[PDB]
Amino acid sequence: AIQGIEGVISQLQATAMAAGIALNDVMADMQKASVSMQMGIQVRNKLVAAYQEVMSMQV
Amino acid sequence: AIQGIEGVISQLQATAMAAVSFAGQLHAALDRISDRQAAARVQAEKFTLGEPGIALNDVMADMQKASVSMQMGIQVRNKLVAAYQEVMSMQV
Amino acid sequence: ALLNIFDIAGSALAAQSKRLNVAASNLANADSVTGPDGQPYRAKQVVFQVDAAPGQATGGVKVASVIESQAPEKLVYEPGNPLADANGYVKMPNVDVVGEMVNTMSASRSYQANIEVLNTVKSMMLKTLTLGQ
Amino acid sequence: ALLNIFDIAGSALAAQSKRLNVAASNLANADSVTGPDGQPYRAKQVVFQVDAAPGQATGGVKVASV
Amino acid sequence: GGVPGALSNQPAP
Amino acid sequence: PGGVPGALSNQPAPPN
Amino acid sequence: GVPGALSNQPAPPNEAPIATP
Amino acid sequence: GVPGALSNQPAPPNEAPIAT
Amino acid sequence: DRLDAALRFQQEALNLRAQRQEILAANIANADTPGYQARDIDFASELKKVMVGVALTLTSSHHIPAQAVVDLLYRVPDQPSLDGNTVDMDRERTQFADNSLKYQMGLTVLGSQLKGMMNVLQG
Amino acid sequence: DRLDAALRFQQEALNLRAQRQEILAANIANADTPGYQARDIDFASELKKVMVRGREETGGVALTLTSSHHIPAQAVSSPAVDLLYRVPDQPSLDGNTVDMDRERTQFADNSLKYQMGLTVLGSQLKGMMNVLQG
Structure with a gap:
């Protein structure tokens, strides 16, 4: 993109300043997605529990 | 329906003016697996029939492939159900 | 990419079955004198090629064509048989019986090896399907 | 019906059995003077043809006639 | 193709 | 280039 | 027709006379 | 080369002539 | 039942193979009987056939339910025997071995179908 | 990213095991073909590569399918692995170097190593579901 090339030159300025599919793949990505979804569910559950504990307060 | 064809022409007019999904993918996978299994079964029945040209090697290999595909479908269903149960267990 | 082993070993099984069939056909007609056209039976043999389309590294095996074996026709002096030559030289097939028996044994052994390959591959596919569970 | 190898080898067995039967019948009638009608016994021969069911590819052995 | 396999049903139908 | 498997290609062939 | 086929008719009896009748 | 090892160059076509 | 319709073909093929196996073994056993004709069945036509069918109607408990209760083709003789026996050893030995092989194949296919239907359910 | 990177070594080793077994099965299939040099790959060097x-793949290009009625078709495709030649043990008149003892030993060894890779990857994935599960 024109804006994409703008971003590339921006990252170059930043550097300046700083100075078919098989079962093997199907199953592995399937498991990885299951793991990531479980992680997201657990993190959200922790956040929701913390929020409800905060809001169940008594001021 | 007459009103149904009216709706079809209306959607065609909509396309004129203006100028696949997960369930669809699962349906496609189920159809593919069932079609493979039916093809293997039909070839096996043809061999059992005595019709010429059908080799036992191909029958047995196709049955093997159909079994593997069925097992793949079973595993996908198992996981999918597990993920759905995990999502529905989330406390809101 | 363990699924391609199915195609490779199935092609190998089919090719070895064809080779065994051709060898048995040659052996069963070692004593023949006549064909359907009156021609003497000519010993036939399959041709094995790598079943690889242009650009494919390694594949299974495929039977290109069936060719008449190159060997002198066995001449028999029987100028009393209704089928004969100008000088009574009956032409009999050039089948080498020892070669055909060894070919049959070799085809059977290669066939069984390919069956073992297919069996262990299917076992591995099932175990892969039981990856995380 | 039969598998191709079964048919080929069984046809070979039957053809060899027919040839052996012809040889045995000839060896039995080596000294026969007359038949049942008054004509001499004539030595029989068996002719092997290739039963090429497909076009020129393979086939077992058949016996057209004695 | 031209040659049927050994494990195939009799070509003769 | 493959060739005939077994007996034919494992017996000493003619020179030419 | 071919030896070893299937037919719905029993084969005729196998008689072998010694003299011409 | 050691038999059973791996080499990047193919083996030459072998022949068994009857008369030299 | 839908389960019967899926397994009907293989069960009928297996039963027909067993019946033809019995017929071939009867042909082998009666090889020496003078005047015995070698009989066989056409597997494909009988499998088509x-x-x-109509279970009689049972109006009550005492009423008794309905009580339940192939065509053989002669083999074409190859060699004429003197005792009238048309059984040929080689032909029927090959047919016997082939029928045994096909019975094993039918058992394998039926077992595979049942095992697939089972692993669909196990969980 | 982190989970993808942590499970990438064993996943890639298992894929390379699959490709090596495909090659070994091709060698076993062509064991009686005259004039076939046995092929094999150096597992460690290709794994690091x-x-x-x-x-990457040699070609693997394919017809594009913009519409829902276009007929799908793909040309030949293969990995970017270096197919090396195995040194023959003893000569053969037909001219193939597929020695069956070597083929079956490598096949069994690759089989066990692929099962080992499956075991390691499954253990790691359970070792992670154990943490996440609650």
């Missing part, structure tokens, strides 16, 4:  | 630079 079996693949292609 | 796939590790540093991602997996």
Whole structure:
């Protein structure tokens, strides 16, 4: 993109300043997605529990 | 329906003016697996029939492939159900 | 990419079955004198090629064509048989019986090896399907 | 019906059995003077043809006639 | 193709 | 280039 | 027709006379 | 080369002539 | 039942193979009987016929339910024997071995179908 | 990213095991073909190569399918692995170097190593579901 090339030159300025599919793949990505979804569910559950504990307060 | 064809022409007019999904993918996978299994079964029945040209090697290999595909479908269903149960267990 | 082993070993099984069939056909007609056209039976043999389309590294095996074996026709002096030559030289097939028996044994052994390959591959596919569970 | 190898080898067995039967019948009638009608016994021969069911590819052995 | 396999049903139908 | 498997290609062939 | 086929008719009896009748 | 090892160059076509 | 319709073909093929196996073994056993004709069945036609009934009605408990209760083709003789026996050893030995092989194949296919239907359910 | 990177070594080793077994099965299939040099790959060097630079294919191009009625078709495709020749043991008149003892030993060894890779990857994935599960 024109804006994409703008971003590339921006990252170059930043550097300046700083100075078919098989079962093997199907199953592995399937498991990885299951793991990531479980992680997201657990993190959200922790956040929701913390929020409800905060809001169940008594001021 | 007459009103149904009216709706079809209306959607065609909509396309004129203006100028696949997960369930669809699962349906496609189920159809593919069932079609493979039916093809293997039909070839096996043809061999059992005595019709010429059908080799036992191909029958047995196709049955093997159909079994593997069925097992793949079973595993996908198992996981999918597990993920759905995990999502529905989330406390809101 | 363990699924391609199915195609490779199935092609190998089919090719070895064809080779065994051709060898048995040659052996069963070692004593023949006549064909359907009156021609003497000519010993036939399959041709094995790598079943690889242009650009494919390694594949299974495929039977290109069936060719008449190159060997002198066995001449028999029987100028009393209704089928004969100008000088009574009956032409009999050039089948080498020892070669055909060894070919049959070799085809059977290669066939069984390919069956073992297919069996262990299917076992591995099932175990892969039981990856995380 | 039969598998191709079964048919080929069984046809070979039957053809060899027919040839052996012809040889045995000839060896039995080596000294026969007359038949049942008054004509001499004539030595029989068996002719092997290739039963090429497909076009020129393979086939077992058949016996057209004695 | 031209040659049927050994494990195939009799070509003769 | 493959060739005939077994007996034919494992017996000493003619020179030419 | 071919030896070893299937037919719905029993084969005729196998008689072998010694003299011409 | 050691038999059973791996080499990047193919083996030459072998022949068994009857008369030299 | 839908379960019967899926397994009908293989069960009928297996039963027909067993019946033809019995017929071939009867041909082998009666090889020496003078005047015995070698009989056989055409597997494909009989399989069509079996693949292609009315249980009597039971009004009460005492009423008794309805009580339940192939065509053989002669083999074409190859060699003429003197005792009238048309059984040929080689032909029927090959047919016997082939029928045994096909019975094993039918058992394998039926077992595979049942095992697939089972692993669909196990969980 | 982190989970993808942590499970990438064993996944790539298992894929390379699959490709090596495909090659060995091809060698076993062509064991009686006259004039076939046995092929095999150096597992360690190719594994490190796939590790540093991602997996690539010779061609693997295919007809594009913009519409829902276009007929799908793909041309030949194969990995970017170096297919090396195995040194023959003893000569043969037909001219193939597929020695069956070597083929079956490598087949069994690759089989066990693929099962080992499956075991390690499954253990790691359970070792992670154990943490996440609650």
